[PDB]
Design a protein around this nucleic acid. Sequence first.
RNA 1: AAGAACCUUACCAAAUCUUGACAUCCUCUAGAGAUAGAGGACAGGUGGUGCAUGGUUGUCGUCAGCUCGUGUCGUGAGAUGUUGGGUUAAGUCCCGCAACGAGCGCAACCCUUAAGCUUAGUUGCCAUCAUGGGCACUCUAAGUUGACUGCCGGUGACAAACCGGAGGAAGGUGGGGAUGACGUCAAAUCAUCAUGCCCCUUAUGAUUUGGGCUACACACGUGCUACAAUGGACAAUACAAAGGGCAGCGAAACCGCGAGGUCAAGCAAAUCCCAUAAAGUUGUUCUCAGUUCGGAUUGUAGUCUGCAACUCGACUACAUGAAGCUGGAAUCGCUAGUAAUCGUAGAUCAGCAUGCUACGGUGAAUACGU
Lengths: 155, 202, 60, 97, 82, 127, 11
Amino acid sequence: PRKGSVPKRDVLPDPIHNSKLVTKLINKIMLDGKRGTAQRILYSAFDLVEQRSGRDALEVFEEAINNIMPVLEVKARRVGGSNYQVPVEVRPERRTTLGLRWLVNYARLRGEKTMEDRLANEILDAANNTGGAVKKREDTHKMAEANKAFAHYRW
Amino acid sequence: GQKINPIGLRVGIIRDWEAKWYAEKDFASLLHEDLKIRKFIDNELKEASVSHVEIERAANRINIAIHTGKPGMVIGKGGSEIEKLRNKLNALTDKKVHINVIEIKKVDLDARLVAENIARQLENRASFRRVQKQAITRAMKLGAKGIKTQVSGRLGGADIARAEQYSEGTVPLHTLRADIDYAHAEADTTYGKLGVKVWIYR
Amino acid sequence: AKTSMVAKQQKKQKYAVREYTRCERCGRPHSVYRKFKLCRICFRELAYKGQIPGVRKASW
Amino acid sequence: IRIRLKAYDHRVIDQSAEKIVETAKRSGADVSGPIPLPTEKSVYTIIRAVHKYKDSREQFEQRTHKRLIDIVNPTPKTVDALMGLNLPSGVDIEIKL
Amino acid sequence: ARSIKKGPFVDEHLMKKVEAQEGSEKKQVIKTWSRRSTIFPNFIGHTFAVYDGRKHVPVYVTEDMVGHKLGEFAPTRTFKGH
Amino acid sequence: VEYRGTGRRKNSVARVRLVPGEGNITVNNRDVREYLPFESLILDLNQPFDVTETKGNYDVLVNVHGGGFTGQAQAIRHGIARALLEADPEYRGSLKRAGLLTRDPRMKERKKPGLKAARRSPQFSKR
Amino acid sequence: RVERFNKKFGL
RNA sequence: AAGAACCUUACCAAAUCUUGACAUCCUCUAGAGAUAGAGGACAGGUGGUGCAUGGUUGUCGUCAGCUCGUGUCGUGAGAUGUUGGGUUAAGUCCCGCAACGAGCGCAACCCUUAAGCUUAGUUGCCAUCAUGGGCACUCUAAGUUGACUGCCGGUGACAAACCGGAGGAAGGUGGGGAUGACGUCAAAUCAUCAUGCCCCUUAUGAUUUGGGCUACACACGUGCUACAAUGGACAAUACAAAGGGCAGCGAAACCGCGAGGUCAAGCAAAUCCCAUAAAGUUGUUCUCAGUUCGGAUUGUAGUCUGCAACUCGACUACAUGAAGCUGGAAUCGCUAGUAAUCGUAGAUCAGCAUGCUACGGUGAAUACGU
Ligand SMILES: [Zn+2]
């Protein structure tokens, strides 16, 4: 807004895994205002995945949100007959908003049945640099490359 | 419809209703009982200077207080006509006790009497710029902190209607704790209806 | 119109499905309370002068 | 002995209640201090416009305040003040004996 | 509709002028307004002139009408096409 | 030898009664893990107990009224902490730095007319 | 129809 | 329009009426029924013109404005003040300056919300005890506390202010309301009401029955229900508030597969009733198909209110099983307990809501900047 800036809202850790990267992933999972049926989907997919792969539940999830952290990205201006897409560098707290919704809306776009395991097959494929969520820090990373020419039009 | 009836911003706050009584049932009868009589002092005492009526109930009998800026007229010598209304209202289906005449002296500081020494001077065809400019003119001498006035409509015949407001002193309408009076009226003439609205602050 | 239709509503009609209220100040059918017998114009035009007990505005 | 207090304004419902409870404390009898009971707010929204403008409305209301008073030792001379009618014309008292 | 415990509703004068030629020679059409009364078996054979608002239009009561109302068989609106 | 405190949150009122004992919390004839349905609320209504570092020293003994499960699981935590500046009031420097002696005034908002909600306008088409 | 009517009521 | 089967009802056809359906002064009998047979001074109009009015109302817009006296400047129209350096949500404040002051606005005085403290203890509350007894706890509501850039650092010497800090329940007009300047639009309203001018007066007035506003090739505005697996279904199991209630809420019992019926306590109501909150939670289950999804449309058989649900009311049982797989061009709301979903409650009301005015439970995501 014009007048200035504001804070955000600072959420207290999970009961169990003891991070705030799993409270801010329920707020991406929650919908319509129902934190009941979002905490089935998020503790039934740390142990629907913890079987499949024999290391911890939180180091195969937290490497599943660090292949997805887009480091560059495009923003726009106009010219007067063209409208060029500039590439800007991404802050250290916006890469954590996008990795966590590039992982949860690339899960309703999947052909499994119950979203215990869509979210479960997407934290284990995305841990190996592959599939849906983690081409999209690659969709979004040529566009900051193709446009490497228009960088001087920056702010 | 831009601004708000200074009795309406100010009842409850610093004003008190002109019907101080209580009913749960019989509210639909005990209210329209009063309109039935209040509109009877509004044709019976039309030619005297009354500016409020209250209607106070206790144990199946009423206690009215007409405020009559010109007493002497309302009563009669020896109370001979303050009772002649009392036997006129008891035909309002009860015995209607205790008419009580209080007198107002500074008779130009009342938005109901002022409003009508204007509104009745226009049906006798006075100018509309000196009927009002002489009551902004009487009422700061008596002590007002601010008076304001306005006539409205077909002023002097003219086929197009305007509003012509003169004013004086401080009349702070928006402040809540300040007590401000007001009253419409309306003159009727060869041309239609006039709109006299007076506003006194003190 | 009015002054013909109100004097056929202060008149007990056949079947008591047939008592429409119709305000007892002006005559208007149209939005009329029971606790007052006063439509939406007259409640506001009377509760401003102050002649309806216990009423003020509401600011909660 | 159980009595009730009503009025649309609170200014004469304590000016009344705690005015005449020591009309009982006059003689030999003691009464429970007045107990306030849940008061009610009714509310009616109407249309400001005489014609076609919903969305511009106006609200009003009307309350009723209630008050409790009960005494614990009536004498032959503690209810002969029952008709001490001095309440200021708005209040409505409820006696049930 | 009406109920089991209430009967059928017939308008109290559509019966008397029908049970007044109980045993009579011929049937002349009966002049009605009561579109709202039900049809009994008694009417079977009658041709009533009901009211559709401006004209009494006639229909003759048969035995497949014997649970209906008198005015289901008399249009009120007119609509030829657009 | 029990301490006292009322805390409110959002139209729930809960009266809490700190005693000397071991970790356990009973609410309205019930064990709160039958009372509270998420493990999210039973972690932070003993937030007071990890800021002062008296993790297990008390049995809790709550009485609740109003609201739903969040506002009751949260009017409580304002009892546990407004009954522990009553035992050692010199605890009060640090139970107030975690922001735990705020009543939290954020209530539910009036509905306004000609709007479909507090702040939700009707759909605008201009033509 | 005629029989149905009488049966439902009593006639 | 905060309630169209009659009435409402201001339109239609038939059946009818003349000082009038309303002021004022002088039990049987024909009938769809009103109605009948028995036992003049004048009213009146929901007729016309909102471009002849008064009152009331939207709008730009809660935007920071809109001027006046007296002085000066200008041949005058006009200007100044009201600009300028700063800052503020704010013509809000300081400083400067041919202006010096003042009015309407702005803020604040008003409510309702977030911590307390005296007064009080039924109908409320239940700590210390077996509901007796208690006023603690919390609730109710009167009085009265409280929030002012008071204080404390350091950038400003335009001087205001600005960022941070510490007592605090809340910190910088706390959160939300009422509160709507001068004028603009010859905006809306002669139909709620009153009314100048012009019309009608065996009618353009008046009373009934029935019809109509519910008409359907179609095009638009506001909503509602869904297209499912964060779902269906059918079982155990918790937790709110805000309000209505006399010829009106209407319990427990019984009867019904169900809408609901018959009996009937108590309550003019902090006591009693409406009143189960539904989301939620623990479970069995179904496993991607126009499906157990979805609930339109019809035939049937019923329940209620009412003189009467035929045109044309809500509900329930059984059968019927429609289009709909997340939306073209473009378009809308919302900055916090708000958006989204979920349920309750009121006014109109015999009867009928998906609409309007309220109320609380669960409750996010983002605001780099300009
Ligand atoms: Zn009216």
